[PDB]
């Protein structure tokens, strides 16, 4: 059972600048870490499949990276639409998701 520790648990960073979400895995999950976006009261939407691959119709500000256990998601410039909960999950083994981190503007 791979446990995906996702930090920080929340963010209130200002709009327009860089956002960095870092997801860490207890064991080796080669590149099967995915990033899902969950706007309030709505199903999650896939953003990053594998490590550092973007899904169809995703803003180009989103980009991920990570090799063995340290994976991160970067947003070039926040937008009003990016105010959502982000979850990192691994699919190297039976799926397990991270705690999910909330993004806030202020």
């Amino acid at each position: 059972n791979i446990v995906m520790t996702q930090s920080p648990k929340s963010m209130s960073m200002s709009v327009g600048e860089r956002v960095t979400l870092s997801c860490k895995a207890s064991e080796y999950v080669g590149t099967y870490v995915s990033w899902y976006q969950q706007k309030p009261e709505q199903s999650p939407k896939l953003l990053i499949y594998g490590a550092s691959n973007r899904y169809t119709g995703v803003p180009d500000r989103f980009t991920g990276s990570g090799s063995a256990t340290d994976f991160t998601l970067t947003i070039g410039s926040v937008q009003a639409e990016d105010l959502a909960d982000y979850h990192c999950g691994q699919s190297y083994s039976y799926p397990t998701f991270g705690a999910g981190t909330k993004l806030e503007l202020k």
Binding site: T31, Y32, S93
Partner: protein, 193 residues
């Protein structure tokens, strides 16, 4: 174990694991023809190969092997330690038995050379120096230092016999303790790795 498609790029043929990647490469429990290695486990990954002809999907599998040391212990390290001790025992020998001590030293040094040359052939002809190479070198240095010590004793004897006795008695305990310290340091710095 990397594999993928020849002549079809990511835009045409893509590879994926049939089931969960962690469970997609299965090793038969009884199937292991390794003699000097232990298979700790396997790891899989999927990636891309950047080529002048295009971008190709490559599926990777890594088999983690840890070398077993029993054979190398028996064939190199225990013989080397035994040769070192065989050189050491000459100190307890009589000073007046100059031929005896000379025979011990020369035979031990020849024995260290033959072990060195026989141990180097087993592994490939790599340029760098391996851990076994350092162990062999240090054991060779110890035996050669024992030879130098005997030479110094024979040089002093009949001129300053008290000095010869002092140096021989000091060596009798300096050499074994230094060898033990080196052995502990080497085994700690390599095994705990």
């Amino acid at each position: 174990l990397k594999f993928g498609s020849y002549a079809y790029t990511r835009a045409e043929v893509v590879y994926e694991w049939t089931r969960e990647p962690a469970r997609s490469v299965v090793v038969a429990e009884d199937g292991s023809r390794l003699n000097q290695y232990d298979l700790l486990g396997q790891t899989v990954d999927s990636g891309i190969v950047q080529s002048s002809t295009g971008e190709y999907v490559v599926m990777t599998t890594h088999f983690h092997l840890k070398r077993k040391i029993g054979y190398f212990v028996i064939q190199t390290y225990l013989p080397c330690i035994m040769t070192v001790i065989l050189s050491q025992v000459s100190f307890w020998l009589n000073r007046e038995s100059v031929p005896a001590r000379t025979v011990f030293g020369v035979t031990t040094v020849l024995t260290m050379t033959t072990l060195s040359i026989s141990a180097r052939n087993s592994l490939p002809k790599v340029a760098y120096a391996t851990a076994m190479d350092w162990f062999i070198a240090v054991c060779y240095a110890f035996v050669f230092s024992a030879l130098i010590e005997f030479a110094t004793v024979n040089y002093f004897t009949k001129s300053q016999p008290a000095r010869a006795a002092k140096i021989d008695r000091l060596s009798r305990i300096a050499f074994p303790l230094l060898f033990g310290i080196f052995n502990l340091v080497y085994w700690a710095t390599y095994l705990n790795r």
